[PDB]
Every structure is written in C-alpha cells, then in structure tokens.
Amino acid sequence: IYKALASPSLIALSSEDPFLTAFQLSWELQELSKVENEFKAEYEELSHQCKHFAKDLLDQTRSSRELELILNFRNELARLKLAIKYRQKEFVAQPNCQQLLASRWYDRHWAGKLITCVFIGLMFPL
Amino acid sequence: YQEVLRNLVKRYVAAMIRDAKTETEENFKELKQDISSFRYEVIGMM
Amino acid sequence: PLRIVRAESELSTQEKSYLSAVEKGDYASVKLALEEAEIYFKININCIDPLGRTALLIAIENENLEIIELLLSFNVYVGDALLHAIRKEVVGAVELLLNHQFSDFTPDITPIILAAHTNNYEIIKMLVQKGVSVPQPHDVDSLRHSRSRLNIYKALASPSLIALSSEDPFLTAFQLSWELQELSKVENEFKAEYEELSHQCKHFAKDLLDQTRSSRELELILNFRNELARLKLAIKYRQKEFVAQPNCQQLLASRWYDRHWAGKLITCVFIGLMFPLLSLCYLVAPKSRYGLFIRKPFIKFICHTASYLTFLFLLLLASQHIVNPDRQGPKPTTVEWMILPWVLGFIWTEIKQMWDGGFQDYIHDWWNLMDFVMNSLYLATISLKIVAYVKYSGCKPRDTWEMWHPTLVAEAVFAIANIFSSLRLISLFTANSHLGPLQISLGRMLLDILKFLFIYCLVLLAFANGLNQLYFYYENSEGMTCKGIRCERQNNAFSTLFETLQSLFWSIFGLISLYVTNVKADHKFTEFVGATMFGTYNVISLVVLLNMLIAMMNNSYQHIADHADIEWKFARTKLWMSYFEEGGTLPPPFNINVRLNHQYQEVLRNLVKRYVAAMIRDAKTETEENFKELKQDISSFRYEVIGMM
Amino acid sequence: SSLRLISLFTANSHLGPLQISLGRMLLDILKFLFIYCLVLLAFANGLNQLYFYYENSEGMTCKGIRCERQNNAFSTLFETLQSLFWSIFGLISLYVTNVKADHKFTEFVGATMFGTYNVISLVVLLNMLIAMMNNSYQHIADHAD
Amino acid sequence: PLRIVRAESELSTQEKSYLSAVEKGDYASVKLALEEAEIYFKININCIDPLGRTALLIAIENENLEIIELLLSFNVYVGDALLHAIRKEVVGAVELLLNHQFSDFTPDITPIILAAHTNNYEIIKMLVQKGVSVPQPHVDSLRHSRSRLNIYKALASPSLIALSSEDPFLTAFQLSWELQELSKVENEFKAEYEELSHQCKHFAKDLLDQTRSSRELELILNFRNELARLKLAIKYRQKEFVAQPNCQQLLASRWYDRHWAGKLITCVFIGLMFPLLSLCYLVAPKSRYGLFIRKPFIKFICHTASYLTFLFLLLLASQHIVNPDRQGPKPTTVEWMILPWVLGFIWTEIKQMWDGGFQDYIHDWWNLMDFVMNSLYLATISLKIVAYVKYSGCKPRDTWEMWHPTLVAEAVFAIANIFSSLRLISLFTANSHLGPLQISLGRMLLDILKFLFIYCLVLLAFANGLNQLYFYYENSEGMTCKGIRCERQNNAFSTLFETLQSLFWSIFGLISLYVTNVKADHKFTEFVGATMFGTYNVISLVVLLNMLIAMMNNSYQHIADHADIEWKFARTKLWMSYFEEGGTLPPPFNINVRLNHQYQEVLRNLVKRYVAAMIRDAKTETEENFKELKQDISSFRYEVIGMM
Numbered sequence A: 001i002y003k004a005l006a007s008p009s010l011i012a013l014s015s016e017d018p019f020l021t022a023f024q025l026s027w028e029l030q031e032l033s034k035v036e037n038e039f040k041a042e043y044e045e046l047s048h049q050c051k052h053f054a055k056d057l058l059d060q061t062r063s064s065r066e067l068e069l070i071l072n073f074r075n076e077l078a079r080l081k082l083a084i085k086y087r088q089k090e091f092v093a094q095p096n097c098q099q100l101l102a103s104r105w106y107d108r109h110w111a112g113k114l115i116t117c118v119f120i121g122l123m124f125p126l
Numbered sequence B: 001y002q003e004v005l006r007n008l009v010k011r012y013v014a015a016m017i018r019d020a021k022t023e024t025e026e027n028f029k030e031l032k033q034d035i036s037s038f039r040y041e042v043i044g045m046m
Numbered sequence C: 001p002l003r004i005v006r007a008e009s010e011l012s013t014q015e016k017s018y019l020s021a022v023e024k025g026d027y028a029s030v031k032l033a034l035e036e037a038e039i040y041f042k043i044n045i046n047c048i049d050p051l052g053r054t055a056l057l058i059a060i061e062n063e064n065l066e067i068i069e070l071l072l073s074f075n076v077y078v079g080d081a082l083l084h085a086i087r088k089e090v091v092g093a094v095e096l097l098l099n100h101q102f103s104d105f106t107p108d109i110t111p112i113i114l115a116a117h118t119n120n121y122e123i124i125k126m127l128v129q130k131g132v133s134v135p136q137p138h139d140v141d142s143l144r145h146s147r148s149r150l151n152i153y154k155a156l157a158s159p160s161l162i163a164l165s166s167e168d169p170f171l172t173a174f175q176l177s178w179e180l181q182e183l184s185k186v187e188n189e190f191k192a193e194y195e196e197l198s199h200q201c202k203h204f205a206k207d208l209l210d211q212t213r214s215s216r217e218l219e220l221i222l223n224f225r226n227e228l229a230r231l232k233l234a235i236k237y238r239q240k241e242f243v244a245q246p247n248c249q250q251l252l253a254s255r256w257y258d259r260h261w262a263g264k265l266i267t268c269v270f271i272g273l274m275f276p277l278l279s280l281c282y283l284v285a286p287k288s289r290y291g292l293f294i295r296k297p298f299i300k301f302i303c304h305t306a307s308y309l310t311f312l313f314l315l316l317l318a319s320q321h322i323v324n325p326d327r328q329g330p331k332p333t334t335v336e337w338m339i340l341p342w343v344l345g346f347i348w349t350e351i352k353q354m355w356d357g358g359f360q361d362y363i364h365d366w367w368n369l370m371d372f373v374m375n376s377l378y379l380a381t382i383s384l385k386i387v388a389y390v391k392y393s394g395c396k397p398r399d400t401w402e403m404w405h406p407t408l409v410a411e412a413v414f415a416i417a418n419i420f421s422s423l424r425l426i427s428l429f430t431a432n433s434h435l436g437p438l439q440i441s442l443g444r445m446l447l448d449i450l451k452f453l454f455i456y457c458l459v460l461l462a463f464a465n466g467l468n469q470l471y472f473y474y475e476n477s478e479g480m481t482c483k484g485i486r487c488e489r490q491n492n493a494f495s496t497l498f499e500t501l502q503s504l505f506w507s508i509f510g511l512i513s514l515y516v517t518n519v520k521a522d523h524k525f526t527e528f529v530g531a532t533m534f535g536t537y538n539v540i541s542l543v544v545l546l547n548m549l550i551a552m553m554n555n556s557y558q559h560i561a562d563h564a565d566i567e568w569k570f571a572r573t574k575l576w577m578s579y580f581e582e583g584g585t586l587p588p589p590f591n592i593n594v595r596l597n598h599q600y601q602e603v604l605r606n607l608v609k610r611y612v613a614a615m616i617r618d619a620k621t622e623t624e625e626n627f628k629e630l631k632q633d634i635s636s637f638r639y640e641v642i643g644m645m
Numbered sequence D: 001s002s003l004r005l006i007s008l009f010t011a012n013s014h015l016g017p018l019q020i021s022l023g024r025m026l027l028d029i030l031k032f033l034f035i036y037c038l039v040l041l042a043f044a045n046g047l048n049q050l051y052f053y054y055e056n057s058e059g060m061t062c063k064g065i066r067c068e069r070q071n072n073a074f075s076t077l078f079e080t081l082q083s084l085f086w087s088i089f090g091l092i093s094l095y096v097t098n099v100k101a102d103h104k105f106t107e108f109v110g111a112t113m114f115g116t117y118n119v120i121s122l123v124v125l126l127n128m129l130i131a132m133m134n135n136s137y138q139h140i141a142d143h144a145d
Numbered sequence E: 001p002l003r004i005v006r007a008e009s010e011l012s013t014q015e016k017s018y019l020s021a022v023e024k025g026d027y028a029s030v031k032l033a034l035e036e037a038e039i040y041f042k043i044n045i046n047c048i049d050p051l052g053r054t055a056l057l058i059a060i061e062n063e064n065l066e067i068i069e070l071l072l073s074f075n076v077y078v079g080d081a082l083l084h085a086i087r088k089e090v091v092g093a094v095e096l097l098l099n100h101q102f103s104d105f106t107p108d109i110t111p112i113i114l115a116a117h118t119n120n121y122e123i124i125k126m127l128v129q130k131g132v133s134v135p136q137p138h139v140d141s142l143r144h145s146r147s148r149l150n151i152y153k154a155l156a157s158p159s160l161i162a163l164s165s166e167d168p169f170l171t172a173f174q175l176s177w178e179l180q181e182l183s184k185v186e187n188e189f190k191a192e193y194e195e196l197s198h199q200c201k202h203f204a205k206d207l208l209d210q211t212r213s214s215r216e217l218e219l220i221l222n223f224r225n226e227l228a229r230l231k232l233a234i235k236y237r238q239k240e241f242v243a244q245p246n247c248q249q250l251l252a253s254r255w256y257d258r259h260w261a262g263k264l265i266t267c268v269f270i271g272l273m274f275p276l277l278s279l280c281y282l283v284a285p286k287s288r289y290g291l292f293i294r295k296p297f298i299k300f301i302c303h304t305a306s307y308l309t310f311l312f313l314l315l316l317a318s319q320h321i322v323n324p325d326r327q328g329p330k331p332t333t334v335e336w337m338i339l340p341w342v343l344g345f346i347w348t349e350i351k352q353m354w355d356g357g358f359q360d361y362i363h364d365w366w367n368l369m370d371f372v373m374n375s376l377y378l379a380t381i382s383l384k385i386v387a388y389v390k391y392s393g394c395k396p397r398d399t400w401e402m403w404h405p406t407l408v409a410e411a412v413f414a415i416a417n418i419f420s421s422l423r424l425i426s427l428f429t430a431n432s433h434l435g436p437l438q439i440s441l442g443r444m445l446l447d448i449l450k451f452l453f454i455y456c457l458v459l460l461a462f463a464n465g466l467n468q469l470y471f472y473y474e475n476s477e478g479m480t481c482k483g484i485r486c487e488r489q490n491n492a493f494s495t496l497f498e499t500l501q502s503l504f505w506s507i508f509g510l511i512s513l514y515v516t517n518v519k520a521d522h523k524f525t526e527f528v529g530a531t532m533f534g535t536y537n538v539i540s541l542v543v544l545l546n547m548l549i550a551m552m553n554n555s556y557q558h559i560a561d562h563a564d565i566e567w568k569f570a571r572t573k574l575w576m577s578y579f580e581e582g583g584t585l586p587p588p589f590n591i592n593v594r595l596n597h598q599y600q601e602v603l604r605n606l607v608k609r610y611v612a613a614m615i616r617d618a619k620t621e622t623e624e625n626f627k628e629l630k631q632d633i634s635s636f637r638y639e640v641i642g643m644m
C-alpha cells in the first residue's frame, strides 16, 4: 500500500498539493522503518524517492516570480521553514533556492574581504 | 498558487514521459513503425 | 481514499482514431481523415493528446516523412516543432520545417543554441548556412538571467560549432576554458556546471592536436607567432592536457637531450665533476668544442645542479671546529668569503626576476616565496654582522654576553637561513621519472592538511585558556635555578599562557611528564581537575583529531593519484622550458607573416577536416551501426516489392 | 641467517601470499626514504650550525645521548644525525636543548627547530606513507595468486 | 618475413554457393541442390567451413526449423548435432533430433549433463521423460578431475533439483556441504567448487521466499521438536536461509512473546528482582510469577543480571573492609558467595559437553575461553585447599618464599578474573548497534594472527643477535635490582629471556636509551648494539606495523560487505539457546501418518511458484522486445502467403 501511495505518477495525478503530500509521506516512511526493522531497507529506500520527487518538481520553475510564490505560501519563507522541519535536504540545497537565500543574505578577492570584515567588526558598538 | 502548480505538474509529466519513453528503446519503436507501415501499404495495395 | 482526476479538462471522440492512425503509420487512413478541407465534421486537426503530443509531433518522433509532408501541406499549426525536431536529431524533419500557453522549452532558447547543445554537425551547418547569430554573453528576475547566460556559454563551448565558425580553433579553445574557469567562482550555485564546461574545452584542443600525421605538421603549430611561441601560451593558460601529449613530449625530449642504470649515474657524476671548467670555457671562448657544450639543456641542468651541491658541502663545513672561537664581533672567516658569491648570485637572480614579472604570478608560487624569505634572512645576517663589527671589540667569554647581542642574533638568523636552502633541493625531483610523480602528489595532499589546522589551533587555545586559568595562582620560582618545561625537573608547565601553549604542544609527542600537574599544596581537588583536563586534551588530539587527519588523507589520494602523470609532465615541461633560452647559462659562482599564416591555415583545415571525420565516423558506431542495417534491409525489400507491382 | 626463514613461507597456503604481497609494497617505501633523508639532513645542518658553539665536556663521565643524563646532543654532525633519528620514537628528552649560559634566545630557536622537525616527520611525513601504502595494496591483491 | 597458410586446404568452388544458400535462407535453392545430387553427383552434402560448420551445423545455428526438417528428411550425418542444439538452447531442433575424429565436447558429456549445465527447464524435461541417468560421483588424472566437476555442476542445477528430487530442501543442504568439503581436498579446483556451494545456498533462499502465509512457513520449519528444520539449517551453516525476513519476524514473536529511555528502565527493573522470580518458579509456578521466567526475553535478562552480580562480587573481593596477611587463611565471606557461581558454571559446562566430548565443542572462541576459565578456577580451589592443611601459621608476607601456594593461588585467581569479564563481550550480539560491530571486529582477527608469524621471526632473529653481542658484559655488583623493571634499567640484553622482554617493551617506548652501554670503554661494540636496536625499532613500527593497518583496511571492506546476514545468524543462534526447556534457572540457583501430505502440497506449490518466477525472470530479461519483433513480421508473412 505504501509502495503505491509513494509513486510519482500517482501523486501528480490525484493529489491536491503534491508538495505537502510528499513531505508527509517521506516522514512517515522514515519513522516506520524503525518499528518494522525486519523490512528496513525497503521502507527507507521508499522514503528516499519521495525526497527526490519534490526536488524534481521544484526544478521545473522558469522565473523568479514562480519560485517566490511557492516558498512564501501560508511570516516570509513559510514554505521553506516547513521544508526544514521535515528535514528535506534535497529541497533546500537547490541552486535557485540557494541563489534566492544568498540574495536575501548579502543584501572582491580574498585580500579585500576580510579587511572590510574587520573594519565592520571593530565598530560593532558604534 | 494553483496556477503555478498546474504548470509545474504538467511540465514535470511532459519531461518524465520523455525520459521514460526515450530512456536504446527508442530505436526499437522505429523498426516496428517501419514494419507496420510496410505491412499496411502491402495490404492496401492488393 | 476516493481518488479522482483533478485539473484535467477532456478529449474528443473522432480525434482518437486520427491519432491512432498517425501513430500506426497508416498513410491512407490519415489521408482520408484529412480530406474535410474547409468543411469539417467538428474534428480538430490541432488536437492534443493528454500526454501533450500532437499529430505533427507524433510523426516527428516516428520520422515518417510521408505523413510529415502531408500534414505540412495541410497548413497544420506548427508552434515549437522545429525545436523538437532539432532535439530529436532528425535531419529530414528540420530540412522540411526550415522551408515553410504551454511551452516545452525555455523562452530564451533559440534553434541555433539548441542545435549547438545537441552537437549535431549537419543541423549546425544547415542553420549557419541560412544565417544565424548567437547573442553576446556580456538584474531583475535573476532566475532567468543566470539561466540564459549558462545556455549561451554551453553553445559556444561545443566542438562541432567551434570548428565550423572559428578562425583559430586552437586559440578560441584556450580563452574559453579560462573564462569558464573564472566564471565558476563568481557563480557559486552553478559551480559544478561551469567547471565541467571548461574541462571539455581542454580535451578538444588535445583531440585536435592528435590529428597530426608527421613531425612537419606538429612543429608548424607549436611555433606560430620567438621559438615555441604557442607552447608558452598553453602553459600560460594551464592547458595541462594539451602540453602533456606524447607527440609534443617526444619533441620536447629531443630538444632537451639533444645507457643503463649503472652507466648513467656514473657519467652524470663525471660530467658534474668538471663544473668550473666549461663555465670559464664559455666565458672565454664560446666555441662548439666547449662553449657550446654547456648550451645543451641537459648539460646546463647538471652544471647548475652540481653547482648547488657544492654550496651545501661547504655549508656543512662552516660549522667545523677546525675552521673563530668565542671572540665578540669577529671578522668573517675563510668559509663565508667563499659563501658570499653564491648568496650574491641568488640575490641578483631574484632581483632580476622581480622586475621582469612585476610581482604578479611571481610571488604566487610555493617555491618562489621560500626564496624571498631565504634571501631576506641572508641579507639580515650581513646587516647584523657588519653592525657587530663596527660597534664591538675585545675577546669576552661567551657565557657572560648579555642577551640580544648582535652576534648571537646574527648567527641564529644564519642557522635558520640555511635550512630553507637545503629544503629547496626538493624541487629538483620533478626531473626524475620515479620521484617526480611522488613529489608532485605530496604537495597537493598538503593543502588539505592546512584546513586541518583551524580545528587543532582552536582546541589548543580552548584547553590552554582553561589550564592557565586553573593553574596561574600557584606559580613559584624560589629554590629553582631552572624554570620552565625545558629542564630536567619540569615545574611550571601551566603557569603562563605562553608556557601553557608550548607545554600542550610537546605533549603530543609524549615529552611532558605527569608530575607537572601537581602543586606545592595538599589541594587534591585542583590537581585532579587539572589532570582530567590534560587527559581530555590528550584524548581529543591524539585519538580523535589525529586519526581523522589520516582518514581524510586517504580519500584524497584516490583523486590526486587518478590524474598524476599529467600534472608531473606539466611540471617537468615547465622545468625544461627554463633551460632552453639564452641569458641564464651562468652558475651563481660564475655570475656575481604572409607565408607562415598561409602554411598554418593550410594545415589547420586538414586537422579540422580530419577531426570532424574521425568524430562522425566514430559517433555513428559508438550497436547503432547495425540498427540501420535492418532498416536498410526493410527499405530495400519495401522498394523492391512496391516497384515490382 | 635467521632472517632467511621467511623465504620458506612460500610453501604454505596461508603465509605464502602474505609474504609475496608484503615484499611488493616495499619498493614504495624505498622511494619515500629520499625525502626523509633530505629533511633530516637539512634540520641536522641547521641545528648543528646553531649549537656547535656551546660544546663542553667538563666534569662529565659520559658524553652524548646514550647515557642517563643526556648532554651534548647537538654539538657535532654525527650526534646531531643520531639525535634526530631517536626523536621519532621519543627517546630524546627536552632538556638537551639547553646550554650552560643564560641565552634564552638561542635556546628558544633550537627548541623551535626541534619542534618543527618533529611536526614535519611525524604528522606530515608518516601519514603520507600510510596513505600511499593503503592505496597501493589494492593493486597487489588483484594479482597475488 | 613471408606470411603463408600453414596446414590448411581449400573447400570447393561449387559448394560455396550451396553453403551460402543455407546461410541466407531460400527453400527453393537449398532443396534443389540436395535433390539434384541424389545419384552420387559429387557435391558432398556434408560440407565443411573455414569455421568448421557443416550443413546441419548451420541450419541449427540459425534455428530455421524448415531447413532442419528438409535436411533431416534425407540421409545426412548428424554426429554430435544433438549436443550443439542443446547448447544453443533451441527447443525445436532438439525436439526434431530426439525423435529421428573431431568434436567440440569432451568424451564424457552426455546430453543430460549438458542440458543440466545449460539449466533449461523444457529440454531437461524432455530428456528426463525419455529416460536418462547421470552417474554417481565417487589413471588419467586430467580426465578424472574434469569428470567429477562436470557431474557436480549437473547435480547442482536448480532446474534438475526442482524436477527430480523428493525434497529439494534436504538435497540443497547436503549438496552444498559435500561441495564445500570437496573444495579443500582439491586445491587446484578451489574457485570452481566454492562457487557451486554458494549457488546451492541461494536456491533454498529463493525457494523459501515463495511463501504467502504464516501457516505455510510454520509447516516448513517445523517439519519432522519445534523448529526442527530451522535447527537443521544451522547445522549445515545456511546463513542465507536463516536470515530471511520471514524467519526473522517469526522468531521475534517467540522471543518477545517505545523509546530508548522507556525500555532501558523497564529492562533494569525486570532484572532488578531476578531472585524473586527464580524462587517463585520453584515454589509456585502456575501462572502469575512462575511462568514469567519462561519467556525467553525475560530469561535472557535474568541470566544477564546474575552475571553482573557475579562481577560485582569480584570487584568487592579487593576491598580492605572485607584482611590480614597470614599463611593459608580461611575463606572470606565473599568467596563463599562466589563459590555457587563457579559451581554453576562448571556444572553447566559439564552438562553441555555431553553432546560431543570435545567433538565440535572446542571449535568456537567462547567455549575454549570457558574451558580455560574453569580450569583456572579448579586450580585456584585446589591450591587454596592444599595451602590450608600444611602451610598454616602467621608470618610477615615479605618474608615468604616464592612458589608458596598462597601466592600461586592468588595469581591464578587474578588471572581468571580477566577471562570472566571478557565473557561479557559475547552478549553484544543481541544489540542492533553494537551487534554488527562485534562480528566485524571478531572476523578481522584471523588476519592479525597471520602477521604474528613474521613479527615473531623478526623478534627472535634480533633477540638472538643482540644476546650474542651483549652476553659477555653481564655484571651484578652493587645492584639491588636486576632487569629492565627497575628505576635505573640494567642488564637489558644480558640473557635471551631479558633480551626477548626488552625488545617487546620497546614497541611502546618504555625502554631507555642508556641500556646499550657497558662498564667498559669499548665504544665499538656499543655502537653496533645501538645500531641493532635502532634497526629493530625501524622495521617493527614503521614498516611491519604500517603494513598491518594497510591490510586491515583492504579486508574490512570485504567483511563489511556481507556483514548483516552473519549478525542475524549469530543472533538467531543466541536466541534459540533460550527457547528449549532445561537450564531456566540462573547460576546462583539450580545447584507421521499425516503432516507428510500438507508438507508435500506446500512444497509442490513452492516449486511451481519458483519455476513460474524463474522462467519469467530469465525469458523476459530486454529479450521481451526481441521476440515481439519476430511476431510483428511473422503475422504479416502469414497474411501475405495466405493471399498468394
């Protein structure tokens, strides 16, 4: 039953939210590999393919407006903070999401960066 | 959100069908297509 | 759950038979199903399969040109069909389509870019013939701006497009790999993709160079624009695959060399013995008998090497007791006068190479900053010795000298100076085929150790701070003529931060005893805490950190040792190229184009036209070559049968 | 005479392959000696050049590193080449870097050079001999029968 | 040189067309050539090829059945075409051939043996239905060695075992055992026999995987008391059979019959009161607390809690509260409480050695360790009693002479305490994390013991050399101590015993440098001795002790590859020791008309499922898209020839 619910072609066809139903279905398949340790390599391998489905579905974004809408659904970056609670490592470590995060973060060569870093650090009370 | 998600799902399906149908299984389809075309032409000639 | 199909509109009745006939290849059925010209029974010729496929697109994927031509004659909507044909690598479909909202391709993709990405020689030629142009690679919606830039750099860096529309394919494969290498450091997210695009440009030059048929063509390429002017440009661009080719390496070895294990070392030593003879011979009469015998690079190298072992031999003889007792501010001895010429020659060579490069890519090397430090130390030795002579005199016992005396500092600096000089003799291993690759791989397994030095230098500081904080209140120096860990009864290991830092260092080698953690009081609680912190430091460093330094120097000797012959040969070529020119043929002791373009562009065309042939007629075969045999048999049988009736 | 009994191990099905594979990862060690012998010579030259001015043999029965109260460790080149070899196994103490004078500058330089030699040969040079013997045993075991 | 053709001839000028006719395939020409050559027309229908292919050997090669029928209609020599058809896996050709000097096969390969080699169900079926019989395995040495290996390859084919064996499970256990032993006495053909044994072990695993209910599984393992066949699969070392997920889910429900810190507290609490449960098992064993020590999981915890209490008594025997110094003392209070545990251990070993007296008893490490520990305890008990009846009285301990019984008894008792606490290691197989670690660390130890035959040789050689050099300078004047275990070490190399002791403590750097001096001004022998000591220190730690860690890495990868079936096998062996009755009290205490038809039905269903799975896993796989292309044109050909 879990091998059928965790098929990419069925999630896309008959799910209201293919992103949310792939976060949940990979969390259950990871905590169910500890109660069924006899069938352990089959339950956790079934969970590793639900993480790649979300990564491949987010990989289809074409512009920076589609990507911004997805990560801010339901304060800001609400969907990205939800993908961290479920330990979606492939979802977060994507070039487009990393580029957006870097653009929010930063808001030269080796010998010119640490100089201004120390310059800013010296005046931290100022 | 739904308008973006529909496009995402559609273009994921359109890529998965390509990557599944094409990937040397593509070469086998062409041989069958040629055989079927030749058979149909022969049947329609006589 | 009650699973349902969500977000799917519909399909139609008649169109299913149409699509089935198109897919099955029935020409007549599609022919009659298309004959509702301008009077249609509500059948849409632009019907879409639920999978997105269309009748025009279905015929493209089956490459049945009869149905394709029939559909094209009926004014079927095309859309992005040319791009699909280009990606599917069907020549006939592209030929037919070239003379006449949901999109499957990125909006910034053009047919020329896609064709270059597919690397198809025929389609690229056909597109270029009709007239095309790639945009200029040269910020609001940064997602598609960074994606567009990568698409055009992937088209330019393609072997089939480069050698069809480039004046000099050898020169454009050097600038392109260099630009993609430095473009992967400003785009950290797409780093893994830019540096792979650069790697296929380096192999393209090597593959193109491998088509030379004789030594006449090979030397025409390397000498373009004084001598070997296109082999110094490859080294300037770090084209390691281009340089380390057998055809080029054999030519370089012939230029260099211009016998068995027991017969080669003896004659090399014999040649090196007469080092000072054929240097004054060159100075007096530069003749073919002796003056031109040092001009052979293999002989110059030996002479420059045998002149360095002489420097070290009397460097070991400068510390013998036989050769200025304990006299304060002494005059230079008989050995340092012999030392001075070599030092002066090294300093002059460094000075002359300083202004020739402008401190760029000159101080950026491991073996060229050790020289700077060594020469600075050698200059400071003289600077202190001359100062000692002019302001001190008289014989005074050494045990009575006050600390920081100029003589002691000068001799300490001199002793430090001549360690780098002997350690620089390591860079002469690249010339040997056995010790060469081993030495090169050792120096690249040492930039990872440098990263395992910000963990240890933080653990050491963290533990030293705590140990000093605990033990700084118990210091004493009464009844002790000797203080510190560097004595026979270590007493004050953890008294000061400077002493604590250097007492936790020697504990790695087991040279710090256990009684150093006691105090001159019966406070067993403090002593136990100190011993526990010392033991905890010993566990972390000697068991955890130093057992995973060797475990990460074993997952880095499988990548480094993978491609090691290329690196060693590149280094050996860089070593050889320094003994080819004129100007440096003096040991420090004795130192103190209308037609050329025609020929080049004529051989270049042959090289390109051989590469493209040896690429196509190998890509065809590399199981696929026999798939077309069955189709050929089927086509012949069909044509014969049809023509018969 | 007693070290030729290992040549009879090529008759046992268990000890046979081990000896053959052990004698093949031994030309790799020989190539690694040519770097240690240069580092040792360089550091011995430096230490002797620093310390040869302080030789003394007054009021001492023994002289060198092979007695209970080690002294005159870096007075000559022979004793310096011996002192840097026994420091690999930790058999050389730390009070041999002192002199019968209050010259703390030269003692600190000698100690720093001794520590630098210890670092290079024990954590940078003996971890690359393990790393390159571990990646050379796999090739020998492919064709060892 | 001039390249020529050596020892070869020409075929023909008119037979080349005849051979090409069957090479391309055309009934008209092929038939005509044979028909027109009936009356001795010098065509030699039994042609030859540069590859050595006759006319019959070409139609069979291309599997064309019509050509084979046409050729076999006439009188054509067959020779060994049957074996070629069997090897080529052509069912039609062998069917036609069955009812109808230079050879490519050794003169011992019968068609049945070759078919078993090919491992095809239908051809073997056809051959067996006709009636065949392989020989029974038991001058020309080369012939005889390639005459028993061919037989065992035929006997170990799954298709033949599943078709002509009364019990495929028994015939898979015993066949792999015989092949495994044969790999030893047959050193040349070692790799071939060992692969057959691993082939037979996977057959039982594959046949067991075709069970679809727990009822069918219990009928296989309990056949011919409880879990009768599961214990037989361990006597034959079937690690793959035991470590099946179903056989591990079944055993877990018999064993057990939550977060970590909700189970650790439960375990420590249930082990806290083992004596209560042990008493209740012997005074009121009806329901409440008498059969609560009968669950194997609870029994395992109670037995562990008794062993931990035994160790806690050994750690209280060294306390000073529990001690004068007098010859032959009366046993203390702790020893009286330790005696029951030793008696229980010895009695348990005595009542477990009767299955075979030293027969496969001393094969595993733990049995030998237990035997050594029990011998040491017996010797301690004997010496402490010997010392009581004769060597009595009070006297200061430092005045006692060595070899006194009260000293040897204490030494032996102290040596036996090390082995008692090392037996606690074997209880790690029951844990999920520490389990596989112990097995990998216990199988990566026979390699270490192979380096100790070279290290010991090097040690002996260097010790002999050093002793021969230094034995003339022995001195014992003004010395209270004599040896390397003194504050001022001396006489380190004066004798072979001390020489062997000194060269061992130098591995850890506990031997000072000044031990290489002599009470003389002989400065040439001192340098030679120091050079020998340094040379030993060179190849003992840099060369010989770095090749030990270099080969652990290249053997741990092989061990850790398949290191989960072995842990499960060990855990099952540990579990099944707590299932049977007898020995349920800790050491402190206790001092077939039917059922042969259901099994047959289940076995035949399993064989049917196995064959129906193997045929589909072999025929289909990328070979499914090759037979379809044949049908695609065969239907069209039939349609065309219907209308023509």
Ligand SMILES: Cn1c(=O)n(CCCO)c(=O)c2c1nc(Oc1ccc(/N=N\c3ccccc3)c(OC(F)(F)F)c1)n2Cc1ccc(Cl)cc1
Binding pocket: C528, C531, C532, C533, C534, C535, C536, C539, C543
């Ligand atoms: C840090 N320390 C320490 O300074 N002194 C010296 C203090 C006085 O000089 C110890 O005597 C000591 C200790 N630690 C100990 O027991 C271990 C040992 C290893 C551990 N770990 N890892 C490794 C890893 C690799 C090699 C060796 C050890 C470990 O850590 C643990 F895992 F958390 F338990 C705990 N003892 C011994 C001791 C003394 C008294 C008692 Cl009652 C109990 C134990």
Ligand SMILES: Cn1c(=O)n(CCCO)c(=O)c2c1nc(Oc1ccc(/N=N\c3ccccc3)c(OC(F)(F)F)c1)n2Cc1ccc(Cl)cc1
Binding pocket: C453, C456, C457, C486, C498, C501, C502, C503, C505, C508, D108, D111, D112, D113, D114, D115, D116, D119, D123
């Ligand atoms: C070479 N030396 C040395 O001879 N003596 C003896 C002289 C006194 O008798 C030191 O006392 C010493 C030292 N080096 C040190 O500090 C380190 C140590 C290790 C480093 N690195 N790696 C390894 C790797 C493996 C094993 C061990 C070390 C390192 O790395 C660096 F920061 F990049 F330099 C820096 N100290 C201690 C010290 C003294 C004074 C100060 Cl102010 C600060 C520190």
Ligand SMILES: Cn1c(=O)n(CCCO)c(=O)c2c1nc(Oc1ccc(/N=N\c3ccccc3)c(OC(F)(F)F)c1)n2Cc1ccc(Cl)cc1
Binding pocket: D033, D036, D078, D081, D082, D085, D086, D088, E527, E530, E531, E532, E533, E534, E535, E538, E542
């Ligand atoms: C065997 N011996 C020795 O007994 N004494 C003590 C005698 C007096 O007590 C040495 O002083 C010594 C030595 N050998 C040396 O030189 C090496 C060093 C390392 C070698 N090898 N490997 C390794 C591997 C890893 C780490 C370090 C070294 C090696 O190669 C060898 F032949 F295989 F040993 C030879 N020296 C030093 C020396 C002193 C005086 C002179 Cl004039 C010349 C040289």
